[PDB]
């Protein structure tokens, strides 16, 4: 089903509509995202951190061990901060064209450089290593545009302007990367506002937890297979002593030592 | 380790007539989990509406489980049967219920009674309903029956308290000057009013209820013959005999029109004292307001 979320917002009284210039919308979105990141800083009281304006994060002062440990972030926050830095760069290029500081050919060539130099200007690879496929395709499109372009009297000068192919590539990446980002930010918001479930959903038994969980389940099987031939009576069940007997038996088998306790019941 | 109290997600707020208002034609708003409970902190169902015209846009404070526990209003936090504080009702009837003060034990016991009400019928002010039927002993001398709208009256314009409400009458908060902050009646801790511990309104109404001799009587020097003034010839001996027939046998039922005295005397001294405590400016015999004194 289509399920237009913009119509879902437009049905509500919290969202209205207007007509706006796209440069003003980009300035609004950049100011909004800067305010969101400052608000996320102040939510966790990380006032010894600081965002620049160009979405550059830096500590105000040196950290302690507690401030070192608690300020470790994830991929989603840092990657969307870098994405907001990239959109800030695009909005800045649009603004300095709109003030007439650069030419429109310069704005096209600057968009060409921005789309061809994403990873050389932003830290995509530090938080998601998949994106250099797209950066390789941007480089290949740059070389194809350059070697279709440098054909006659033009050379390797700095004024080549084309941005539609990299625009296509990064926006098809953006519709790819949107719902994983939304789910990661939703889990971030739920851990921020509902708190962290310290117990929560039970952990998987991974590779580092194989032998410990195997011996734990073996010990539980020992308890379930030792509680059941006991008749009525016997206050000294001595299951700790049976565990010591079993551990000594396994250690003596590991040591190839003949293990025998002559005082031990037969089954 | 996976324990929590469940959320009060239900309709039908149990409210006073006073906070309910005077309009039969009521428009209503309901938030599902908008706020939390003011006592047990469960996320409860918020009910916000406008009972009249000069209004606070009143809304519910505590959860429906706490209101089911204490039989008080969800807004006014006073007992629904009489309009009285729960400190007054617990002093009148039974004060052995109480509540734990620590948060973890309070939430655990709240989850226990929430499970109890969820297994129960649903419309019951828990265990002391069987012992709360013995009412109108003294608390109905001062229990409200009128819908009190001066507590539903909206909050004070603090801007015109500072003298700077530029809106004037456009401001929906009250443009009257506030009460005394040094007055202990103005303090009103909400948890104290819930717990029934040292509520100043409850202490003021208890101090007021200590003033009237509605059941003192006994002005006769070891004599069962109590003379009820204010009776006259309207109260005869037959009304006193019918009143004392429930208490046993009437030793002396008479009417004296010279002193306007209904002379009531049961055969038992305890029954005569009970009849005098009933008729000491608190009973009407044959349409005549009786006030017991010496006879």
């Amino acid at each position: 089903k289509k399920r237009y979320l913009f119509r879902s917002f437009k049905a509500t009284k919290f969202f209205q509509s207007t007509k706006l210039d796209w440069v003003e919308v980009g300035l609004q979105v950049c100011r909004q995202g800067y305010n969101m990141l400052n608000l996320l800083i102040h939510r966790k009281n990380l006032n010894y951190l600081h965002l620049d304006y160009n979405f550059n994060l830096k500590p105000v002062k040196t950290l302690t061990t507690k401030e070192r440990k608690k300020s470790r972030f994830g991929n989603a926050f840092h990657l969307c901060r870098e994405v907001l830095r990239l959109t800030k760069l695009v909005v800045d290029s649009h603004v300095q064209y709109r003030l007439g500081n650069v030419d429109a050919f310069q704005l096209a060539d600057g968009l060409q450089y921005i789309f061809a130099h994403v990873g050389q200007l932003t830290g995509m690879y530090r938080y998601k290593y998949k994106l250099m496929r797209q950066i390789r395709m941007c480089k290949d499109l740059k070389h194809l545009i350059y070697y279709r372009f440098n054909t006659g009297p033009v050379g390797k000068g700095p004024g080549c302007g084309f941005w539609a192919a990299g625009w296509r590539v990064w926006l098809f990446f953006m519709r790819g990367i949107t719902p994983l980002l939304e789910r990661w930010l939703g889990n971030l918001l739920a851990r921020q506002f509902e708190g962290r479930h310290s117990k929560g959903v039970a952990k998987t038994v991974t590779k580092q937890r194989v032998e410990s969980h195997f011996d734990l389940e073996l010990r539980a099987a020992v308890m379930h297979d030792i509680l059941d031939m006991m008749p009525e009576g016997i206050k000294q069940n001595k299951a700790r002593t049976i565990l010591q007997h079993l551990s000594e038996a396994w250690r003596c088998w590991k040591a190839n030592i003949p293990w025998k306790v002559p005082g031990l019941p037969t089954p | 380790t996976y324990n929590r109290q469940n959320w009060e997600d239900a309709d039908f707020p149990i409210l006073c007539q006073t906070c309910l208002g005077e309009n039969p034609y009521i428009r209503m708003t309901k938030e599902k989990y908008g706020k939390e409970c003011k006592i047990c902190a469960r996320p409860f169902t918020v009910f916000r509406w406008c009972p009249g015209v000069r209004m606070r846009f009143k809304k519910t404070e505590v959860c429906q489980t706490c209101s089911k526990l204490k039989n008080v209003c969800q807004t006014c936090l006073l007992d629904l049967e009489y309009g009285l504080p729960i400190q007054v009702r617990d002093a009148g009837l039974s004060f052995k219920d109480d509540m734990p003060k620590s948060d973890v034990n309070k939430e655990y016991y709240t989850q226990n009674m929430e499970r109890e009400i969820s297994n129960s019928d649903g419309t019951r002010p828990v265990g002391m309903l069987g012992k709360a039927t013995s009412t109108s002993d003294m608390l109905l001398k001062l229990a409200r029956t009128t819908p009190y709208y001066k507590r539903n009256r909206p909050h004070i314009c603090s801007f015109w308290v500072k003298g700077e409400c530029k809106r004037g009458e456009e401001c929906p908060y009250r443009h009257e000057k506030p009460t005394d902050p040094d007055d202990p009646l103005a303090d009103q801790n909400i948890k104290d009013r819930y717990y029934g511990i040292n509520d100043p309104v409850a202490d003021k109404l208890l101090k007021r209820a200590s003033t009237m001799p509605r059941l003192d009587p006994p002005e006769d020097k070891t004599i069962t013959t109590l003379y009820v003034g204010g009776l006259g010839d309207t109260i005869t001996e037959t009304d006193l005999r019918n009143h004392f027939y429930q208490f046993g046998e009437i030793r002396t039922i008479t009417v004296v029109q010279r002193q306007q005295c209904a002379f009531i005397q049961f055969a038992t001294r305890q029954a005569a004292e009970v009849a005098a405590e009933k008729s000491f400016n608190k009973l009407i015999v044959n349409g005549r307001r009786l006030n017991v004194k010496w006879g």
Partner: protein, 100 residues
């Protein structure tokens, strides 16, 4: 838990359909009318059917021991399933293969 707002990527909607057994997949409509007994004896019968001057000596005469490869036959001795890994034949092969 009726209140959680954290969503794992293994908690996504996926594999939401349920395939069912067709009549080529031993549907319960034919499980009831089919009797498995004479199927089992016909398949066991099929399995039982398809179960089946100067002269020198000999040049190799200058040795001390003759015909030493006489009773050497593996056959089903390796096929004897010893359920003891100290005496497992695969374990012995493992030790001689992985220990020089």
């Amino acid at each position: 838990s009726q209140l959680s707002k954290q969503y794992s990527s293994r908690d996504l909607p996926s594999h939401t359909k349920i395939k069912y057994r067709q009549t080529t997949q031993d549907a319960p409509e034919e499980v009831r009318n089919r009797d498995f007994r004479r199927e089992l004896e016909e398949r066991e019968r099929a399995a039982a059917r398809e179960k089946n001057f100067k002269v020198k000596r000999r040049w190799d005469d200058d040795v001390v021991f003759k015909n030493c490869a006489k009773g050497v036959d593996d056959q089903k001795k390796d096929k004897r399933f010893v359920n003891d890994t100290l005496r497992s034949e695969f374990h012995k092969k493992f030790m001689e293969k992985y220990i020089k």
